[PDB]
Amino acid sequence: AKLVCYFTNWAQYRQGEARFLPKDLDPSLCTHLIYAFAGMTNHQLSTTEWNDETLYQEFNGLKKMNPKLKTLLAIGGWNFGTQKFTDMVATANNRQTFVNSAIRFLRKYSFDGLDLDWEYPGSQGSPAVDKERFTTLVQDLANAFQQEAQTSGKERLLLSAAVPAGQTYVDAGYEVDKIAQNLDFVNLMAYDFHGSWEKVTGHNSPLYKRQEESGAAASLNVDAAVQQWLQKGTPASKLILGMPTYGRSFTLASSSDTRVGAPATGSGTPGPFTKEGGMLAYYEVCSWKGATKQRIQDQKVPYIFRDNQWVGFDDVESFKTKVSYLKQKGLGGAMVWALDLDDFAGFSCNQGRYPLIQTLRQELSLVP
Ligand SMILES: CC(=O)N[C@@H]1[C@@H](O)[C@H](O[C@@H]2O[C@H](CO)[C@@H](O)[C@H](O)[C@H]2NC(C)=O)[C@@H](CO)O[C@H]1O
């Protein structure tokens, strides 16, 4: 089993106990640690924060403590958008520039691989031609990594990709069968199924559908996303089930209608540490004062409300349920977004450090 965990290079800017610093990294919590995010300049891999080089040395320095650990560098993410990917994959020449830059960069900073997080080929402004060009990029990287291993005698760089759960994005961007041949593993982003971009409440990461759902909505759940990627050609051993350590929040139209599917007027109030309306870290809801928590019966996940604020999130119980699920489906492991949104310092939830991610590690039988 794998436990793939994302580190984010902006968590260092949160205040107080929420500030995530190198001392908060645990070399043996996860099997694979992915650094979010690198960017791109002139079609070439590049840093995005002023101290990335300092953090790269910390990050890969964990491997001194746990020599089994593998690290990857992720390029892209939601905010990065698509234009730079589109421009880089538009020609073989530009892809070659990128691939060669990536190998040099990963070796320079001692990363064990690259995680592609383009959100997404064929969507978010990216043209339809990018579906096949993404296939080619994946093939180009895999083949070049194989070649460099032969030339250098070093262990081959890994290639993974973070991929969407929703059929609209999957079919617009991903030749699933083809890319599965070349990716070492596939990080399924089985979250953001619902959120405050919708005008009714819905859970960030439900395992199964609700009875009231039909049509496309009935596939906006973890089980459907997993089965989608498997049936479209991803080997189970390569499919890594993503898990969120955050929830998605809504302001209710009325505090007297708190159902799943109740009318919402927008994002929930920003969290005191995360300061982003529409999401909250686990540590911002795990002990939410004066709130009312219950479970969504068929979806196997909790929601919590307080006055006109409503939040769908994951807890220890839902993480256990999801690991039981992934094991039943024979998947390659779990992935988690993100280290810094769990109660990494044990300051809020009275459940110790990393209560959610330690649950994943325990349920996968990966405890040192
Ligand atoms: C692998 C993965 O989940 N990638 C995406 C993430 O970028 C995204 O997290 C969001 O990243 C933004 C930067 O690109 C941040 O500004 C934003 O705060 C952050 N949101 C959260 C809830 O952490 C995650 C989660 O939505 O999903 C992908 O879209």
Amino acid in position 84:
K
295 lies in the same domain as 331: no
The CB-based long-range contact list for 93-102 (8 Å cut-off, 24+ gap) reads: 94/43, 95/136, 95/137, 95/140, 96/140, 97/42, 97/43, 97/44, 98/40, 98/43, 98/44, 98/45, 98/137, 99/140, 99/141, 99/144, 100/144, 101/43, 101/44, 101/45, 102/45, 102/141
Dihedrals phi, psi of 221, to nearest 5 degrees: -155, 165
Using the atom order of ligand 1, give the atom closest to the CA of residue 37.
14
As given in the structure block, the two tokens for residue 353 are 């450090």
281 lies in the same domain as 166: no
E strand spans, the chain: 2-8, 32-41, 44-46, 70-76, 113-117, 158-164, 185-189, 239-244, 246-252, 264-267, 279-281, 292-296, 301-306, 309-312, 333-337
Range of the domain at 235: 1-244+314-368
d(CA 291, CA 309): 9
d(CA 143, CA 234): 19
162 lies in the same domain as 71: yes
Structural domain ending residue among the three candidates 313, 344, 360? 313
The answer to whether 120 is annotated as binding is yes
41 lies in the same domain as 155: yes
Residues 119, 148, 284, 363: which is the catalytic one? Answer: 119
Dihedrals phi, psi of 330, to nearest 5 degrees: 70, 30
Structural resolution in Å? 1.1
The answer to whether 173 is annotated as binding is no
CA of 205 to the centre of ligand 1 (A): 14
Using the atom order of ligand 1, give the atom closest to the CA of residue 341.
23
Q: Residues enclosing ligand 1, CB less than 6 A?
A: 6, 77-79, 117, 119, 162, 189, 192, 246, 276, 279, 337-338
55 lies in the same domain as 78: yes
304 lies in the same domain as 327: no
Closest residue by CA, ligand 1 atom 19: 78
The answer to whether 191 is annotated as binding is yes
As given in the structure block, the two tokens for residue 248 are 């998605």
Q: Which of 215, 111, 108 is nearest to 159 (CA)?
A: 111
d(CA 145, CA 143): 5
As given in the structure block, the two tokens for residue 307 are 């006055």
The DSSP secondary-structure symbol of 215 reads G
Residue showing tokens 């690259």: 114
Residue 94's domain is classified under what CATH number? 3.20.20.80
Structural domain ending residue among the three candidates 294, 313, 332? 313
Helix (H/G/I), strand (E/B), else coil: 241: strand
Give yes or no: 119 in active site. Answer: yes
Instruction: Let me know the angle formed at the C-alpha of 209 by 189 and 171, rounded to the nearest 5 degrees.
Output: 45
As given in the structure block, the two tokens for residue 218 are 């009935």
CA of 148 to the centre of ligand 1 (A): 31
Closest residue by CA, ligand 1 atom 20: 279
Rounded to the nearest angstrom, the gap between the alpha carbon of residue 123 and the centroid of all alpha carbons in its chain is 18
133 lies in the same domain as 278: no
Rounded to the nearest angstrom, the gap between the alpha carbon of residue 100 and the centroid of all alpha carbons in its chain is 26
Using the atom order of ligand 1, give the atom closest to the CA of residue 162.
1
Dihedrals phi, psi of 334, to nearest 5 degrees: -120, 150
Which residues are CB-contacts of 111 (< 8 A; sequence separation ≥ 6)? 35, 56, 60, 71, 72, 73, 105, 157
C-beta atoms surrounding 168 within 10 Å:
12
Residue 296's domain is classified under what CATH number? 3.10.50.10
309 lies in the same domain as 237: no
d(CA 7, CA 264): 31
As given in the structure block, the two tokens for residue 40 are 């791109």
46 lies in the same domain as 122: yes
The answer to whether 312 is annotated as binding is no
CA of 79 to the centre of ligand 1 (A): 8
CA dihedral 314→318→319→323, nearest 10 degrees, is -150
Closest residue by CA, ligand 1 atom 18: 276
Residue showing tokens 């919708």: 198
Structural domain ending residue among the three candidates 295, 313, 331? 313
54 lies in the same domain as 159: yes
239 lies in the same domain as 251: no
Number of separate domains in the chain? 2
104 lies in the same domain as 251: no
